[PDB]
Amino acid sequence: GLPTMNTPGSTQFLTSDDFQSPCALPQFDVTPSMNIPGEVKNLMEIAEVDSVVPVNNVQDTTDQMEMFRIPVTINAPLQQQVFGLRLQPGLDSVFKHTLLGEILNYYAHWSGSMKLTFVFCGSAMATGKFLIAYSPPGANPPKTRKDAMLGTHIIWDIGLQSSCVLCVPWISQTHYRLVQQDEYTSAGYVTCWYQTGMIVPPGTPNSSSIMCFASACNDFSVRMLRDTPFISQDNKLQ
Amino acid sequence: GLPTMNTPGSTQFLTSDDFQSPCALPQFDVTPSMNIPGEVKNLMEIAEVDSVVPVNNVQDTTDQMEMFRIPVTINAPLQQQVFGLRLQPGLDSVFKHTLLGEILNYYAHWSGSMKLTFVFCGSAMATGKFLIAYSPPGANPPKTRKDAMLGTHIIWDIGLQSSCVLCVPWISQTHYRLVQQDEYTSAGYVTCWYQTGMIVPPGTPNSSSIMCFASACNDFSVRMLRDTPFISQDNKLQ
Amino acid sequence: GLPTMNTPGSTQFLTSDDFQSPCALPQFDVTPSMNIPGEVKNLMEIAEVDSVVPVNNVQD
Amino acid sequence: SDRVRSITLGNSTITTQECANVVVGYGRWPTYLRDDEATAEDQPTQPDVATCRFYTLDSIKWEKGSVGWWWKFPEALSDMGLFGQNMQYHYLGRAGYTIHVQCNASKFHQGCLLVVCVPEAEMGGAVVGQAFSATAMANGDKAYEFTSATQSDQTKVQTAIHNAGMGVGVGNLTIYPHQWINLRTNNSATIVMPYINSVPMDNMFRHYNFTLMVIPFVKLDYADTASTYVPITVTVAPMCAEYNGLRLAQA
Amino acid sequence: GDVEEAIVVHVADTMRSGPSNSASVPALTAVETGHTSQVTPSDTMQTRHVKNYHSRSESTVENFLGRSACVYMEEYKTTDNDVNKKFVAWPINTKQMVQMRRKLEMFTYLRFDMEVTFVITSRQDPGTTLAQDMPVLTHQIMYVPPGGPIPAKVDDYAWQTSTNPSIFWTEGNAPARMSIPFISIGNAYSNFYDGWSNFDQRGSYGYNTLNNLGHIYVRHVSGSSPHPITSTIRVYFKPKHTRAWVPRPPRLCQYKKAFSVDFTPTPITDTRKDINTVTT
Amino acid sequence: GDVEEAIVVHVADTMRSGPSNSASVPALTAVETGHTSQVTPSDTMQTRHVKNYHSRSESTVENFLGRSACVYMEEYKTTDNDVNKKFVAWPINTKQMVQMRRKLEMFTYLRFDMEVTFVITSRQDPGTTLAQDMPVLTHQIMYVPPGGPIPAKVDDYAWQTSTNPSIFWTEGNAPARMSIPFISIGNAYSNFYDGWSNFDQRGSYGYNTLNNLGHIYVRHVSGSSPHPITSTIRVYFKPKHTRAWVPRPPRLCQYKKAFSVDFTPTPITDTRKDINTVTT
Amino acid sequence: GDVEEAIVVHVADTMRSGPSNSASVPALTAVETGHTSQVTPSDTMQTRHVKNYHSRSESTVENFLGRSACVYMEEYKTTDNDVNKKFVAWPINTKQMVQMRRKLEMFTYLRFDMEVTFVITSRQDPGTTLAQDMPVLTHQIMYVPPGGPIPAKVDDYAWQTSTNPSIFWTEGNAPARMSIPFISIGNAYSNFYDGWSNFDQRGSYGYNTLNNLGHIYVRHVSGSSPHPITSTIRVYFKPKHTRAWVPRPPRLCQYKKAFSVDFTPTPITDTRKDINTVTT
Amino acid sequence: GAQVSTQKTGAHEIIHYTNINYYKDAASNSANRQDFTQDPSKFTEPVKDVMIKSLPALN
Amino acid sequence: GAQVSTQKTGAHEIIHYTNINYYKDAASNSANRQDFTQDPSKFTEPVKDVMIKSLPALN
Amino acid sequence: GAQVSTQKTGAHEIIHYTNINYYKDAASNSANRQDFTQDPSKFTEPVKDVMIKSLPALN
Ligand SMILES: CCCCCCCCCCCCCCCC(=O)O
Ligand SMILES: CCCCCCCCCCCCCCCC(=O)O
Ligand SMILES: CCCCCCCCCCCCCCCC(=O)O
Ligand SMILES: CCCCCCCCCCCCCC(=O)O
Ligand SMILES: CCCCCCCCCCCCCC(=O)O
Ligand SMILES: CCCCCCCCCCCCCC(=O)O
């Protein structure tokens, strides 16, 4: 017949190949298709939805739900820190298990900007201002409010609108960053400080809580599929 | 299906083959290209750059840098030899490790002409003339300046222009020469002699130095890749 | 992929076959050709030249 | 005459009356980053004349026994004018450079210097293995000296001159952008270096873009004169500098 | 014309933004509406113009689920005293192996074709005497849709498939492979089923009610060595032409049952010294 | 039209030159400018007209680097008491083998696709009793991008790759092969990196900081012979579609570390009797 | 148009000839001129008209030399005490085997491409104990152009070819094969060279001076059996696209040296009883 | 019956491949992984009244 | 979707070969080793002012 | 890029075959053994003055 010669790679089984194969059930009639609501075509669509971030990981939380709410008090020194965290969406315990971190943990590289949304859940009569800042990578994280205000930041005024958005820009030397972030691909820090202080009238609770939401922007993307390290087994399930 | 028959060479692994193979990371998005300065597309571009030739290999050099400078003196016999060397760019110790010899040592055949550039690094008040000659292959290298002047040569006058170029022509019986040159593919000799002598005024050093640069012309070419013998290992690096 | 089936003679080495094979020295530049005198293209050209015949084989 | 050159950057000027041509990197002139190659999103800052100007990098002595020196950039300018301040306050940076080396001597002196800019001049330690701190090869504008003999102290780099501290033949450094100062005909060398890297921008404290080396191939010599040494001076001017990522002062 | 030549997106670019002072407040919103804010860095700080060539090609569900993953392995011996130990019988399901299970359960309904690959290896069992000569072995893989006859021993009559599809494979060749269409009675596969089997809310509960995909059987065709030999089979699934609906959050707790959602409560995440700790 | 038929240089010729007597001095130049002279033999002696058909086809970087070269080999046994000795785990890098390392380090930055080929061979270990019968062995090669789970033993759960690419290969066939795209986060691979990891100039130094390419793991799928068997794997790399920037001089000193430039000083070249010696 | 369809001689016919009586004398000639007579039977006797369909297709040099012929064989063992006996190292030449040597030396200069085929076979060495189990062996063929490094032992570093071409072949498959272009420095290969190496007519003499084609090395990749195994390799050459110049008479005396023309005088031919003997 | 279509390449640098189907069942074809359309509005903007980003969310 | 191009031959003596791509990723293609363009001016003539070979290098 | 040419047959009795080149080097092609031109005059008639067979060789 037609002369041929086999090249390297013949008879190998590569788990990510694309080849045609015979059908074991010839002329099988499949069930008609139906347009079920809520079709998802790309995982970034899932990644772009907000999810509550457990910022309050203080190592002595006897109640798990306490992790989601950030404490706030009426009387505090003029400049004081509300919270601080590292911007490692796929590695930091804060973002590790969120709806965005779970998607990232299936991939090796990521790039793009992020949205952090903060919502004030105090009384309607309470008021205050907060300074939320993003500090790009450096040798030392900010220690005081004067250090923090030198970076990207927004002044948040609490009023009828209960929510404010800090958009973390994509500032990097490389087009992509590793999910298993190392010192070479650091991403910076995020901190929140009192701007004016929280004031309340008579007959209101003396403490309030804030919550944080994390999601990706429309320029976010991922690359290089890999297996997630969060799930494992020791024996075959039965 | 389609009848076929395998021919000799099936299932072999030839290290220099050109075949298509499946991609292990389907639909991977590569980083955008960027035009970094200094793109090199052909090794001859590297080979055409000048490099300092260590001509002074006198077997008693306690200082390595002394190899690069060729001594010269004010008072010398009327005819005297400055230096002499064999024209074996890929085998001679003089040219072995230069920027041209290193490239040649990756190949088996070579052809084309060469440039030798000499620069005088004496005082501004010093003066002299030198005769630089190329003697094609023969049974005996030149012994005196009258023997040398019968071959290709140039008279070099030292003045405001500090450099002179001896272009070694391609005179050969075969289109190509072996890098591991043998007696069959000899290439000749290069020698330099005093033409008039070096003269200096009062208040100047009595000795001076010359340096040599080697490079290929625009008709140079190589052939038949091979492994270089200059680098070896005895155990796996760790 | 494309279904196929091997026929008799696969993987054999026949010394008088004509098949293409990979080149071990890709993009090698051969020396230019030169017209040397006296090219021979067919052995009958040699056979048509005269040669002396040793007829006197008389065993002594 | 083509032996005269004049360069004007910012509020500073350089004049040379006895010089060779100018070498321009790899044929590329410094330029700003384009819109289709950038990755960072926030607006850059371009100080212009405040930073793109000539800075004089201290001076050294050329003796009969000198072996060579090197400087690492942009660390050498880390504390020089507003260039240093912008380096301190920003996460990312990008700039080309103009390097001018001055060395003058009478007509009765002799000697030759090689001036070369080596991109990514990674160096090895004196003792195989081990490690050295970032003080054995860069401590500001101070110059570091090569050594004729093999280095023995484990706390510093292998300074053997004939290997250039990189494991390569010193005679092959001609492949990089370079120029020669030959006292017969030359007093200064000028090199224009574009920004060369594998990424559009990089942190100017963490990464050494390139290294400047000055090596005497033909040692200095003279006779019967009152001048005992020949000073060498280095001047550098950033070009088309821009920064990104304002993050308070930090190393 | 024989060739049909008639048969790329890139993420959004960044636009230049300057100083602003106006009544519009893009940064302020209200999450109570269930609406995710669509602000971009251009709306809260000055930005340069950037052209993005990044694409989301590798994040599509087709590529995300288009990787072969192991779903089952078992061992069977060529000769032994126990009849049940000389062949395998597996009720097809995707809940046996944790990784592919978690990948699939990120969606509620799935519809795809399937590509199945079988990897078979053999080894001689240890013993006091191993010297034997045995030709190459051959294996049979049989698929029995629900309700069909099931073999009870290695040499039963049921192995003479006249209508059940089968594959005969000889050791030393490439692994066996085939394609399977969408064989669900419903309009889509369901990973989860919050309901009962009986109409009065009794009986089996959960996904177990909708698993009626059949069985797979494997044996050595006629190999029976003087000394025992053990073979292992691995089954790999690879969805093709995938469609998914109704995404759901990834699982947090470890799996404990192959046909149940049962779990043990797990902490939300790991802890740190205090709310301000940012160092390593 | 189905066929796209729309898809050689030769070196410069030598021109005839006669006697000359003029003020032009092509031979005299000045190297101080950093300029390499462009003189040709036609400019300093009488020459004949010569047509050159020589081409520089084989000197291109594509052809220079387009040869498969070994980058790693290691051994693993089918059965043994030490768990760590039954499989391999290699952090991918190109500095292990000297020849290809030196070929690559002639350039500062490289950008290419990769073609990887695996050669696997097996041999029986010596012993007092070797008589056994064992079927053909099968091997698995697993690639784990950085941050993924790593197997700790030959029969770990991690080997059930659902997203990590893998290859299953049976002895006696052609060697395995695949293609890999340009997988660097930066715009080009960097052979050299003169910098530190931490922002205050501390920590790791050199090329070691930018090596985050992942790992490769290998094992026998299920082979476990009564007597030990040792297998060796060799990995070959072959750049494709290559581009290079900023050439640098070839190394002179021998290599001594796999992740450092450390060296011992070496003489510039070999010596000879005196500056006039020209004989053998 | 995709197909290039645009891409047989027969010997001379015999013409009818009748009686003649004339002054022309085609039969009479003079060999002293060096001219071979062109007479035909039509010129000396009456002949009939004959159409000849015979062709000289099989006498062309392309077909004459286009047959694979053995040029070298050698043996090497998988394990042994002598290091030099575990691999082969052959300086390439065509004078080793008599038949192809004589075929080639009918011409003075040749120019052709080459097709090389390798045939490898293995056998177990005899001994007092032969019971072992060994997987399939693998072999490497390495080509080293002149001047390259040469391996000194079976496990040397030189076997990690980064630029030398090589082939890895597994037993049981088709023989290895490749193509080689015209790799001579001169414009044609020379079978004979009447000259010396040194310019003063001294040193090596003959064809030995122009043989600089390189070496070929072969080894078992990693096979090392408990008991010795011997393998033999045979090399076959097959010219392609052949051109030849200056034919010379075939050799009469037997060959005695592989790199010399040395011989012993031989009689012109065999004898017979007398000049008139015509019987058997 | 041969389809010709572009194959994926990076950034902005014969980038064509040919495909033919051999089997009679559409399930036998190779994966159709060249489609890149997406629309996140179903999950990010499920509200009834359209919300303008520049305007206040409420009132 | 078949490319036809010349194959390398010596000196000045059907010298055509056919190529078809089978895979959807450009990384799967064979090496493009037929390009022979080169320009050494970047390394041999990096000076600013053009230098004429026949004229003196300086003055 | 397919060549079509006649294949050898005996005497005077679809005698066509098709060939395609797969490799980029002309050395990889198959043997070109279909050429049958020949000219023995170089060895049989090397004399300067033309000799007529019917005429006497000398005078
Ligand atoms: C939500 C999970 C649904 C899983 C659906 C799996 C459908 C594929 C079943 C294939 C079983 C038969 C394969 C082997 C057939 C044979 O050997 O001929
Ligand atoms: C400067 C040196 C850079 C080296 C870059 C090497 C990139 C290739 C890495 C390939 C690793 C994976 C190969 C095996 C994959 C598999 O088995 O499926
Ligand atoms: C007059 C006689 C001339 C003989 C010329 C022979 C030229 C062919 C040499 C081929 C040597 C290399 C073959 C093996 C290469 C490999 O294993 O990759
Ligand atoms: C079962 C189908 C086998 C097809 C074999 C390869 C194609 C041969 C015909 C050449 C391509 C033309 C196809 C077409 O006309 O659409
Ligand atoms: C996966 C592609 C398989 C292609 C099989 C060989 C080509 C068959 C069709 C004949 C050539 C025509 C190709 C074309 O129309 O561009
Ligand atoms: C590497 C080349 C592979 C060619 C595969 C066989 C030919 C397929 C296309 C059908 C023939 C048309 C060829 C042509 O257009 O010239």
Residue numbers in the entry:
A (entry chain C), B (entry chain C): 1 to 238
C (entry chain C): 1 to 60
D (entry chain B): 10 to 260
E (entry chain A), F (entry chain A), G (entry chain A): 1 to 7, 11 to 283
H (entry chain D), I (entry chain D), J (entry chain D): 2 to 14, 24 to 69
Q: What does the publication say?
A:
Like other picornaviruses, CVA9 has a small, ~30-nm-diameter, nonenveloped viral capsid. Its positive-sense single-stranded RNA genome is ~7,500 bases long and encodes 4 structural proteins (VP1 to 4) and 7 nonstructural proteins (2A to C and 3A to D).
To evaluate structural changes in the CVA9 virions induced by different treatments, we solved cryo-EM structures of the most populated classes from intact, faf-BSA-treated, and ion-treated CVA9 data sets to 2.9, 3.5, and 3.3 Å resolution, respectively. Furthermore, the base-stacking interaction between vRNA and VP2 Trp38 next to the 2-fold axis inside the intact virion could be clearly observed. As expected, the main particle population in the control data set was that of intact particles (89%), but there were also expanded particles containing viral genome (5%) and empty nonexpanded capsids observed (6%). In the intact virion, the RNA was tethered to the capsid via the VP2 Trp38, but it also was in close contact all over the capsid interior. In the control sample, 8.8% of the spectral counts for the structural proteins corresponded to VP4 (13 spectra out of 134), which agreed well with the stoichiometry-based calculations from the virion amino acid composition, where VP4 accounted for 7.8% of the total.
